[PDB]
Design a protein around this nucleic acid. Sequence first.
RNA 1: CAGACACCAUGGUGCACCUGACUCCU
RNA 2: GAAACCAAAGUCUUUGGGUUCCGGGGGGAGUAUGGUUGCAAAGCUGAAACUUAAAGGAAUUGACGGAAGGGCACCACCAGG
RNA 3: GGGCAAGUCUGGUCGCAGCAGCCGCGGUAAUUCCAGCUCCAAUAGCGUAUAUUAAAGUUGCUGCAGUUAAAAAGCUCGUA
Lengths: 71, 126, 226, 208, 129, 59, 82, 57, 99
Amino acid sequence: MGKCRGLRTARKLRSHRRDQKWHDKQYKKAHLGTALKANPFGGASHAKGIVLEKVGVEAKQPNSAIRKCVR
Amino acid sequence: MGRVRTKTVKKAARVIIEKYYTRLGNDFHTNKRVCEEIAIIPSKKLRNKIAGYVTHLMKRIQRGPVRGISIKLQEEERERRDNYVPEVSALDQEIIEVDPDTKEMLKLLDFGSLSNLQVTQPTVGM
Amino acid sequence: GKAGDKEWLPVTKLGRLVKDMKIKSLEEIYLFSLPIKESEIIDFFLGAALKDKVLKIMPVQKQTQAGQRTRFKAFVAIGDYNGHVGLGMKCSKEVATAIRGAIILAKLSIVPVRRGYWGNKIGKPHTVRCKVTGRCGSVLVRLIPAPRGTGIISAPVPKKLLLMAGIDDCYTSAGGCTATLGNFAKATFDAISKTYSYLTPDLWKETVFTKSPYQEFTDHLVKTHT
Amino acid sequence: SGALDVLQMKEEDVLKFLAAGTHLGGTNLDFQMEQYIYKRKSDGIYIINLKRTWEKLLLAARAIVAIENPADVSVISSRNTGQRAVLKFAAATGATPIAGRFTPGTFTNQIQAAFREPRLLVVTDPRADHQPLTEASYVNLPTIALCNTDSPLRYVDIAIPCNNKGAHSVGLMWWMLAREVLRMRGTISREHPWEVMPDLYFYRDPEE
Amino acid sequence: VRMNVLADALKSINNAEKRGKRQVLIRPCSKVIVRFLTVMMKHGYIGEFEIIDDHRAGKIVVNLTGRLNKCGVISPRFDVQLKDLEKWQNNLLPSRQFGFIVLTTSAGIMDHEEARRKHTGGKILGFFF
Amino acid sequence: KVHGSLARVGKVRGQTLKVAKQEKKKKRTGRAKRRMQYNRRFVNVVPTFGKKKGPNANS
Amino acid sequence: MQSNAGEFVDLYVPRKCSASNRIIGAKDHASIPMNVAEVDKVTGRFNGQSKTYAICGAIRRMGESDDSILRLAKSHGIVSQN
Amino acid sequence: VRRACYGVLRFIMESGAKGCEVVVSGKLRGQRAKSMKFVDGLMIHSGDPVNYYVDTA
Amino acid sequence: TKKRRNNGRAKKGRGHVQPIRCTNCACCVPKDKAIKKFVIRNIVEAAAVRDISEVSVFDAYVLPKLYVKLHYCVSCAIHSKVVRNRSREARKDRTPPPR
RNA sequence: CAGACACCAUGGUGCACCUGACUCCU
RNA sequence: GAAACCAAAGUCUUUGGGUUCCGGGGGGAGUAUGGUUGCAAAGCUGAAACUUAAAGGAAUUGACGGAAGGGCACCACCAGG
RNA sequence: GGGCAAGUCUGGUCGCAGCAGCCGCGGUAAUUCCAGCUCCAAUAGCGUAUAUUAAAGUUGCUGCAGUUAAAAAGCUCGUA
């Protein structure tokens, strides 16, 4: 804890709560638009696209198998 | 250095002393044959160690009760000598030198005695 | 074909007054605030509905000079659904030894919990009279009474514990560590023995300070020792 | 109270309090025993209040009195100065004497060398008898403790202030507390003091 | 300094009942302190109290009883239009069967019970149960 | 890492094969199915017998 | 702890104390009564019924019980020299 | 496994034993070796009287 | 956590102090965070006094004493065992062993 | 207490696994 | 209190003395970016992509030590054959 | 395979193919695959994706934490 508390501090906690809320990882990047920017979804639920290539991915350890993704 | 006496000899020999302190002696071949007579020992050599430690105990216990073993003939005799009368709890300390606050306690108990004095070279107690 | 038996033995002044029909219930000793070392005293008095709940038998271990050494940390709770619950923890090398050990430790450690009403004044208690709480390693388990028909709104571990009390209507809000379930029930056991511990104004009517049935029966207690 | 007159300290008692030195105490500050202190000596040695001694000597006896058995009264003396005294207390009162070590577990410990069932414990020094005082607190046992001006007071029920350490202040109280119970229940009845001296009491002092 | 002359006094008497203590030296003795002391005296949570008149600010010695479990302050205070009063009876009182909340209302400092009976609120003071 | 070559697709599926199992009595649907699930599990004989099972347990 | 007027909800009534005005609960250890015999009134040969006083472990673990019964046996009687 | 070792180990103690122990040793639950010790009563192993005092199978 | 409470020796009532070297390693440690040591010792130590005191003629004067105040760094106090590893319950002890 | 104290690098991998009942019918 | 420990690291779920300051798993990173000072050295304000289901804390138990203190064996020495 | 209800099934596969939100199976006597079968679940829906609300007292106004896990500025005056 540790805070000021009075009868005019609605002006304070309006500023204080959101500015501490900006420190949240989930609050920041979702409200930076970066999830729309770095990732194609975030602004879509489904999105149609052309296959660039078929990528037969050997899995980095652990779980030794071949992933076989697509690009 | 070796073959020091374990739990089995000392626990067994203790019961033998407190019951047979008449019929035990200090000769081994007495007490070895007495531990033939009064005890059931599964080895002669164990009987050698037990009855020998009986002779170790009987030499000790005939010097009165030693530590770790005692006989009620010796124990109650201590209490029979513990009829000791040191006092009558009346010396008489009727009036003698006492503390001035003990005197004040005796003043609250209405007898009084001679009072200590002189707070001098303090700490009184140093 | 195999069967079990029971033999009574008193190890205290109580267990004689238990076996001689002088103490008839734990409610006396619960009023008397006396120790109990015989779980059969409880078994002399109720012997029924005392639901055994093996909570978690969790394998805990210590490392040794030659590899490791493990044991089963079984959590067995007892309770009839009437205002009396218990708990036993037995750390044994076996499971069922740790179970049947903590069964009897649950039997010996049955305690009364004080049920009441939410905003009710009549109706044969359905919840607590007061919001109660308890911690066990930073895991705060707070209990909030509910009226009837609401239910036991809880994590599944205190939901069985509030069930065994007969507190059928309760709200929960818990903070702390999310995985240590034995510390959940041990913090929950703190709140339920706290039900007597809150001083109601109904409890302001003080008692006559009863007179130690050791001394009250000390001549009847003469069997081989008073 | 009983016969109120000799229950308000006789000079036979008063001299014996001075003879056994019970009025003296330690040098340590108290917060529970300073009420029982009459005065302090020059640069501090506490004269205890023998009024507080006697009035607790009465009531702690009265706690033992109207228990119909001294068998569930286990009196405790780890001090060897009181071991003759609790021998002569159990000789007079009939209580259960506890000499020396408590052997931790007589009140707990189902599997044990022993088990006792008292109702009230009487203690020479609750620091010297803290291991009784632990298992007094474990299984709901009240405990009388003889306390000086340096004694512990946690879990200590009704406390008789005495010097009760080393001197015959120990064996005088066991002379007096066996006096007070035979005063109440005994052949030294109707609140009469003893005709038995504390020389059947005070500890052995190895003899010649 | 003492920004809250009640919370500095409530920490006294709670710690007093933690010790089982039957006396406190409270100060700087507002009348708002006194009116809370009078009400809880009527409810039998505590006993009587005796003020010692000083010209510094005055101090009160209070004989209390062990019938109380928690007395708290609303620091800082808030306004109650008799519609928030039940939520403090919800969130801050353990049941709706016992527990009293005191308010300064413009018919005087009173409990929550006369506040509902008169229907004229004011500012919230604190609680005791 | 960087690697992108496929090796085997359906390697286990080409060597693990399937059949079907026909309804001697039907898959009852909706109403009388969910009605059947209670009464079959309890009242046929009324349960007096048994312990330590699930409805598919070789356990 | 009771319910509606004649109806009793609680399983029992736990004991109390007079030194801290605090209850003695369920299985509380060093939470004991103190039975002090009524000794009678110069005629002597103590009269039966012991004066009872319930003591909790809290006033015991805080070391209060010595003056507490002194506030209960001296203050209420009967005791000589008081 | 435990229940048969609850039944017989009781029963050989029911008929009487100064000690009685049951060991089931070797592979169990796949390719891993296990050992199931079910001991009742007192079992000594010192010196010469280990050989006389036991009945082993 | 604080493996030591006083951290060698306390610096309470003092915001900052002067440092010191080791008397046998010259390592910089503070004055009230190091291991100090007085030495009162003869200049005429017992190897020589069986022959010095016999040849000490016109010498009814007593044996002189050397007065040395030693100060170690903690690194060369421990390996030399000026101080050494005690238990953490013994680490509470502010007690120097007697001379 | 109170005589003499050199450098010495590296190094690696799977199985500790989640419940109760006693109609051997003698 | 997670314990460590702490009359404070108490009077907290029975949650509120007042006022200020700061954290939201671990990074990338006080790096980038711009501000900014400082003679400079550098100081200060202060990210993202991407990376992750663990990171961390006490405490128990081992094991280890060019950590320390104990005992014993010619599978270890000594004296030796 | 657990979480998570219902296969310590039956076969195959053998760290492969795959599966697996997470914890995880598969390196041969696979309860994680792939299927069969059996079971469970809801049900004319059910499942997924993404989104957001709670759960979350992990933004803590109620009601967070800041010695050692994140978190008292180097210290002090000192205005808002």
